[model samples]
Target: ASPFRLASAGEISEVQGILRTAGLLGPEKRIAYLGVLDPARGAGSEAEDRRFRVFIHDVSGARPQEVTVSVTNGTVISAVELDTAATGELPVLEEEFEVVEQLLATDERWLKALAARNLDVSKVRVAPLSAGVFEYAEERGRRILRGLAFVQDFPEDSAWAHPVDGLVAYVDVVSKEVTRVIDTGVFPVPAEHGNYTDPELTGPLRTTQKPISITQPEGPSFTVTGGNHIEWEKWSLDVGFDVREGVVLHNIAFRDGDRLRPIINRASIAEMVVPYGDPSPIRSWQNYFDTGEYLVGQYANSLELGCDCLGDITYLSPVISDAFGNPREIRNGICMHEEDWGILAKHSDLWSGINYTRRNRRMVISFFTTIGNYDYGFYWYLYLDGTIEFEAKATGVVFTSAFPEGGSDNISQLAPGLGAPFHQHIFSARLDMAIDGFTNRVEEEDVVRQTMGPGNERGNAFSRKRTVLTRESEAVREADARTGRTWIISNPESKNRLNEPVGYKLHAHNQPTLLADPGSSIARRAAFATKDLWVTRYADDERYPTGDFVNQHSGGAGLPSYIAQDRDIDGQDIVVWHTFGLTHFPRVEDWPIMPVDTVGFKLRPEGFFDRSPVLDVPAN
Candidate 1:
């Protein structure tokens, strides 16, 4: 029997039992972590229906190995080792890390280290820090954790806040031993008197409350079949996941009257890069490939009611696997809902002297991943007027690095010894678009200043310029404010009444320019960031934006290699790669905790529809 949805709780158990029965569950030969390895529909063998490959880490011996298990009929069909390279974040469990912190809080050596700086550990809190490394393992590697001691108590409440002082400590994750302590003569406000409180800690300030409610009247406007198959308005897709990419949507189709039209076969955030500035501390060369280095899906936040989302929301639970092959449900790991969008389309006719407007609605699916001090929220929106948007939201506390000696030359300073450095969050999404049908054409449309020669030319007028990109190599483009550039994916045979091929236009916002040198490690690892847009023919295993294995990667298998074939994209099924970037130079106002910073782009209907799809929307 085939499992249609994500591995259910029972399916995970069955797979685990299959592995254990094969003598792979011992202390030395234990299976460390496993997740459903998703594959595209109709792209595999007959056994693909009943088969679900699993990615596992086997730490049975001295060195760890990356293992892949393909199971069917309660048996393992294949087990292969990919590599022995380190493939994940700190394996030290979170509960174990808390125990380490608790033990350190009462340690004599740590207490002495605090007293050496004339500081008391009684009124301070110890927080675990991200001990960063880049392939330092496989070469004298040890899991050393870093932490900062912050003043916890204040004399009164005013406007003062505690970020970090100069005092810091390093401890062994396994041994729970305080390895070193550093104090650079930087003292935070020791007295928290007249403190107004960190705004993040205060709640229910004003009593401006009321009963907020949402009424569907008829019921929810969407439905789910086979658990993961979602159908909302004109949108339909099957949600899936793997060990690498978090949420993967497959077999996406859009409703067209009586028929369901294929739009995208699969879509996912292949990789993300968060490159920090400062370049001083040993953790300076911090160019983190978030999705590649750490599995964001496993770290998904379980959203609670009245906090993460509101207004008639439906929750989804995704299964997560641990190092011991134990699977668990991440309750409310994803949220879905239909939102009222005020006005969709509006027009007022002077002849009739009447106003006309239609309220718009949207279906949204979202997931949040909290990686250390940062929380990343991913949302996919389907608009009533044939527009699809992908939004990335960043929130949570800023990761502060130590900069003692009261320095003014560092990045934004939240407090003494605290520096919130500059960094860039770059994200890339692999869009496998089938526009109207499979074969599609690419066009680069730009608004350029025209040199209207002698036609009352003031050199101030602009005109539209369209370039038909016939090959893959010529389809790479960028987001430009000067020319107002955009890309259009159109079906040649799907023409509208206006005699133009129906298409979808791409629009990006706040796409920052890459300032890193082309050959720098930061740039090479994320070479896909070199360009904002890339169009290529669909390849089976070329889904990752920055390549498959990026933990200790040397850089090569990214978009550049995918485009190396330079296959003709014109009149062929193609995949669109979009990279959105945000260059953040931190500020003191963003300290303690930061508000949501968002960046997004949309794929709007250019001529994809014959006429106004929402013209018949009822008005109140």
Candidate 2:
């Protein structure tokens, strides 16, 4: 048993039972999250170090509590109720979504707003969203959810297609009441059903593409041991899941002959914020911290075979707890498969009259979660040539609203009476580097051209210059596409055959960061998205890019707070936080269900390998 292993069903049940009997949890209290408590680096064995962390929301008191229980010792380690005013709110529960709908049903203000539109109250569906930080007098220091109305004509109607704009309902979950309802003038709901799946709306399907089959008759080349640990080719890594961050990879390493070379100790997309650019009064506060506010892992979709994945696939079902303390399994939550990536290396030597080539393959670990109107897929890839890549695929229907008079620069008219606002989905990936060993250093590399004085006689000299990021303050950096910039995580203690430090280079897509004004609420809450890269000394408690609590948080937390101390990072265990995403200005082609827009970064071996690692591949 390893400390890094996920908590077993028996362990979760035992811990919950112990807490319940100890008066730490009850019917009125809900378990927001339960996961394995990772032991400290260089810690003891699992028998003495194993523990589980539980986040409990005491609905009766509107309090968020953190508890650590040792299933091995059968004792509670620690319990603390976090202050909502300081730490902000915990992730919303599945039950809270329904609780808001039920509370809004009896409210006069909310019902009257719907009645004014001449719509059936029962047919309308209200989307319970995270009440973002506004510093409102009533919502401050309270457990609340913002409700937006959508017209659901029937049971299977796409409610997102017909938004009842200009009405916002704020509900306090603890009190089970709608605290306030804001009715800004009524706007006509989009008449289009926006149901792409129904044949009546989309008409006949396209038949131009021929069927392609992918088969591995002998089975996949990867192997799964201990359920969560996977080994493919020369790569070995462990899969982990949390309520906030969906898929987490740990202890990533590559087999080098007789030794296993460590690369990343842990990696995950810690936080993501979608900030709408529309300045309309009703849409200004549309910034959403999807991972921190609404638990994405808890809402992960159960992937289907042949549809979600092709070829030989292996599924790892993760165990997650519901609003209650009961455990639930998301069958086929994580999909793993090998993909043929064409050529690894190819050469045709004319003089030697010989040709050599090797086929490339990669193992992909992925999961998809639907948040509101958008679906996001998180993928991690390991290549045979020791390259690691992470990609986020965004799909599903775009969030729509009633088309305004004339035109608005903030939105694109998708249809006759429907418009989708411009927004940016900014994500932060936390990469804890353990490059050869624990002690590592970061260097920024940029290509610089000589001024043709002495070094460049022909004026064709362009060489890479490396700048060591020695401290936290010096490590905050942005991508420079002009210079072909990249950041390298290197272990000074380990050197390659060429005498250079063993290192891995981080290749960013150099996309836009947060686009909000510096003084805006979204800018303050999602400060991590303002920069492309951040390097900080590793700390077990520092997991999320945005602070642990993000819902209704004031400002200056997470990455900003972590680097406030400006600790030394040179030749120390460090974590690299890369912010990458797309700034989407909606197009008409993106209407109905938008196609998958992919964005991600790559981690390629810089000086870590002695030579091309895939040269030994057999051509059968």
Candidate 3:
């Protein structure tokens, strides 16, 4: 069996039964997440033994436990209690969301607070938020979800437009009670109904636009084998999905003559943080770890045929466990299709009066997930020219607050009294590199201009400088657009025709890093966002960039903890972590529903190909 194959529905059910039989799960507990346990790399025997990892949250005791079950043997291997005070809180389950709403319904303080704001309790919607760590005495080590209030005129009305600002409710899921209610005087709700779908609210639909049709009469150019394994043109990779990391790509390879050359062993957007820039007490604790805290994959949108994707499309259904450990399938959770780009290569032979051109096509694998106010689309594009690009598309209703006529610097005036707070969506991508084979080294390449006295008297000489990153400390680097900086991951054991190590270069977007102060709580929890690139020795246990449990996490975990040893990385099996994202100072046009804002990076072939790999393409 291939190690990259997705866990089957039957396998998930079997693993859950084994955990229940072993008393690792019971009526008092709910499964937070379940997925195939990745086998140790290069361990042949371990790969053969199929295992599953289960995280269970005990609602009665308010404790989290990690269990390893062997479906191959029908047994529970190990069960350990997680110290949430040190390791951070487990993911908020779907069941816990209902519990919070229920608790708020009967609470006198929360109901009175809503009444004071002149809002109907029935029309108000509560958003269960992961209670961030502020060292509150009563909230420490408790299973808590802070509830935010919003009002909807009707069931169909957009609740985000009418936020019940300056009020928050803290609810304890285990106790099924409201711990506290902080009502700090509500602001006037915006009169506008932020419904983008209704024609009445949108005024009128656009009639000038023409219908565009996409079709592939001969069928698509890609093929799916063994369920998740996809092959398109020269690209081959296994598409994987889980509750935490969402869409993951495994065993990414390129066809090179007779052999399939391995590029990335595994890759995923490991973790993401959306931190609000406002420092008001109501907005100060707005930093959220979307993937880790909310479980983005569990909320995957069931994509429509002609809406979410176009042309000849292939869909992959992903099975995920609900809070009760029951398997639920998200139909069309993943979409794959081909896009016609402008050109791959073009040149004109002036002497012969002839031009050569080849059209460019790229295979797109993508998925979208909705977390509260924002909808994010993660797309991976594989091109004909051996280039891999990851793009994040953010679109949806921007989280807003009630503001005065003159807005603050930390927010943008969307409407008269409506404001969208400035925020940053910082994402971390974990790329397990296998450039040609596993033993790889990284080098930082920078373009430098030579001084007149050194290389040439004419002072027109400039060259590229390569600095080998020998250790973990030396590899903590940032992107410098001035120098056209890029990181190269090369397999030292494999050489190309020029006797150079075959490699792939990372081109980063060099956007703003985390703007939080170094000593701030957000900076401590999300240390991975402070830099652009990090290289570390490969470890199967180190899967997430923000550690295992990100909800209400303290600090000094994940990337910071992984690199504490600072081991040698030169010519060794390594993983590269890149941080790329957008810092938004919201515009007035971003009202109601914002347009899609994109941010990502590229992995281009450096010396991996001896020459242009697409030269043999037949002219159209």
- For candidate 1, write residues 278-352 as lDDT tens digits: 655433556666776666787898888768888777788888666566777889988888999888888899999
* TM-score of every candidate: 0.84, 0.98, 0.97
Alpha carbon lDDT of residue 208, candidate 1? 78
Q: List the residue pairs that clash in candidate 1.
A: 157-195, 158-194, 158-195, 158-196, 159-196
> Candidate 1 vs candidate 3: which has greater lDDT?
3
Which residues of candidate 1, in runs, are more than 4 Å off? 1-4, 29-33, 40-50, 60-63, 85-204, 209-211, 242-244, 352-354, 402-410, 454-461, 470-472, 497-499
| Candidate 3 lDDT trough over 10 residues, lowest sum | 39-48
lDDT tens digits, residues 1-620, model 2? 55567656777778778888889887788888787766688734434666788888987875779889888888899999899888888778888888877888889998899899998889888888888878588778888888888899889888988988888888888878778899999888888887788999778998898978998999999998887888889898899988789899999999998899999999999999999999877778888789989878988999999999887889988887766667788989999999999988889999999998889999999999998789999999999999999999999888877778788889889888788899999999999999988999999999987797776788887789999999998889999999999999999999999999999999999998998999999998899999999999999899888887888888888999999879999999999999999899888878778988999999999989999888789986
lDDT of 3 at 554: 81
Error of 2 at 524 (Å): 1.1
